[PDB]
From a paper:
Here we characterize a metal-dependent, bifunctional isoprenyl diphosphate synthase from the leaf beetle Phaedon cochleariae by structural and functional analyses. Inter- and intramolecular cooperative effects in the homodimer strongly depend on the provided metal ions and regulate the biosynthetic flux of terpene precursors to either biological defence or physiological development. Strikingly, a unique chain length determination domain adapts to form geranyl or farnesyl pyrophosphate by altering enzyme symmetry and ligand affinity between both subunits.
In both chains, the N terminus and C terminus as well as the loops between αD–αE (183–201) and αH–α1 (329–332) are disordered.
Author numbering:
A (entry chain A): 87 to 182, 202 to 328, 333 to 426
B (entry chain B): 86 to 183, 202 to 426
Amino acid sequence: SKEESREFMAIFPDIVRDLTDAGRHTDIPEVTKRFAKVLQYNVPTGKKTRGLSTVIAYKMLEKPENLTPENVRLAGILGWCVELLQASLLIMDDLMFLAINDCLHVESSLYSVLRKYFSHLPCYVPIIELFHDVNFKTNMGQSLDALCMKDGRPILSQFTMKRYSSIVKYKTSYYTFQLPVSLGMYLADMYDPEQHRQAKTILMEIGEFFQIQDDFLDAFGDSKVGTDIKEGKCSWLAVVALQRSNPAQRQIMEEHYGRPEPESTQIIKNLYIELGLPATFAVYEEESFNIIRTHIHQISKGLPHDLFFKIMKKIYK
Amino acid sequence: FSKEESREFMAIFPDIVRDLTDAGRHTDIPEVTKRFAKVLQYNVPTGKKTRGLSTVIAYKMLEKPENLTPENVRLAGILGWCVELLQASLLIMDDLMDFLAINDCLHVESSLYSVLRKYFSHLPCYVPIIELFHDVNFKTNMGQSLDALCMKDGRPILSQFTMKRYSSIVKYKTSYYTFQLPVSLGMYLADMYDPEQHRQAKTILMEIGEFFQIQDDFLDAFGDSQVTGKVGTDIKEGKCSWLAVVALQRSNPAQRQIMEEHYGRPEPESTQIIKNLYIELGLPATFAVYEEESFNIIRTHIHQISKGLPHDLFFKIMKKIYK
Ligand SMILES: [Mg+2]
Ligand SMILES: [Mg+2]
C-alpha cells in the first residue's frame, strides 16, 4: 500500500543519522560525511521489495492487537537492515579498493542499527544470529556460482539442475525470501525452529520460481538488456538447454555460450527458441504454482497461509 | 609465548576447520565446503599468529588463577582463532588489492561468527564479544576509508598527510583489531565488563599500536632488507607513512616541492630522491628520539594502570613491540 511504502521510506533518513551523525567518531568527520553519501547514493533508490516484505511478514505474523505504530516501525528498521545487506551485495556484483571497502562498510553498518533499536529485546540474539548465518550461506552460494566458471569461460559440465538449485538456494533465496519472513517471525516472538523450518521449505520453492522467471526474462523479456548469455551465467535456460540438446546443439553451447560478440548471444537465443525453452518455461510456471500452493495448504502450526499466498501473488501475478 | 601455549593453541585449528566444513552441515554442497576447508587451511594457520596468542595471554593474565582451567584456556584459544580468522580476511584482501577471490575474504570473516555461536552462545560474555567484533569491523572499515582518502586517482594528496589524520588511520585501521580486540576479548571471557577497565586498557594499547605502526613505517625505508626479509614500497605506493607526515612538517618550500614531484612515483630513482630527502631532514634521528620518548610515556602509563588491571600483561605487550 501507499501508506506502507511511505512509512517505510520515512525511516531511511533516521538510519543515516544513526550511522553518520550520532556524535560518534568525532575525530574523522570526512569519513562519516562520505559514508552518509555512500548510504544516500546506494541504499534508498528503486524498489525496496525485500525491506517491505519484512514489514508485510511482521504485519501478517503478529497478533492484530500487538500491531502498534512503534512495532511496525521496528519491522521497517529490520527491513532497512535487509536493504543494507542487499545494497552491499548489489554494489559488490556491479564492481565485479575504496569501492570494495564501501560495500563491506554498508554491510557492517546493519549490526550498528540492530544494536541501537533491538539490543534490549528478546529477539536481539536470534536476529543477529540469522544475519550471521544468512551471510555465511550467501558466501557459500557465491562460491558455488564461481565454481561454474574457469578463467573467463563457463564450465558447461557444471551446469546441472542440482547445482543450479543449490546456487539459487544459497546465493539468493536465503537472504531474499527466508531472511524477511524469519525477521518478521522473531519480531513477533515466534522462536519455534519447526515453524522456521516449515516457512523455509515453502520460501525456497517460491525462491526457485522467482530466479527461474528472472533467468527466462533475461533472454525473452521486453526491455535492462539481459547479459546472462554474454557473461556465461549458470542460468535455468542454459541448464535446460544442455538437458534438451543433441550433440550438434551441445557444440553450439560449447562454442558460443559466454562469448562477448553480439552474434554469439543471438546464436544462443536462437538455440533456446529452437529447443522450445519458452514452452518449457510456460509448463514449469503452471506446474510450480500448483505444487507450491498444495504445499502451503499442508502448512500446519500457527503459520498463516495468507502470508505465503501474498508472496506468491507478487511473484506469479 | 611458551611452547605449551603455542602447541595448545595450534591443536585447536583442525577442530575449527571441521566445525565449519565437516560436521554434517550443508550436506547438499560438498564441493563448496571441501574447497572452503582448503581456503582456511591454506591461509589461516600459517606464520606467527601474534593476535591469536595475544588473546590467550590476555585471558590467562586477567582471569582469577583458580578459574584458569584447561577448558577455559581452550575457549581463550578459540577466541584467538576468531581474531586470526579476521586477520586472514584482512591479509587476503590486502594481497588481492595489490586461486582466492574477494568472496573467500568475506567467507573467512563471516566464519568467525559461526565459531562464536558454536562455543560461546551459552555464556554471559557472548553478546559483549559479538558486539565487540561488530564495532571493530565497522571501525576497521572507517580506518580503511580514511587511508583511501589520502589518494586521488593514482597520486597521494600531500595536504591530507597530517599527524592528526595519520594517528586516526593507525587507530581505526590497525590498532583496534590488532591490540584492543585481543585484550577486550580476554577481559570479556574473564567476565570483566566495566567500561572504565576497557577504556584504561585502550589508552595504553592505542599508544602501543601507534609506536608499532611508526616503527614499521620507519623500517619500510631504513630497515635492512636482508634482516626484515622484505623490500619496502611505501614511497612508490604513496602511502600515508609517518616518514612522509614528519617530512612535510620539517620541509622548507624547496623540500616540499621534492615531495610533491617524487612521492608516490613508480620510478626507482624517485624512491632514492625521497629517501635522500628523509636523510637530509634527519628522520632517522627524529625516529630515535620518538622511540625513546614514546617508550618512556607508555612505560609510565603502564606503571600508573588502575581499575584493578594487571600491569604485567601490558608490559609483556609493550616489550614484544619495542624488543
Ligand atoms: Mg538476472
Ligand atoms: Mg608497512
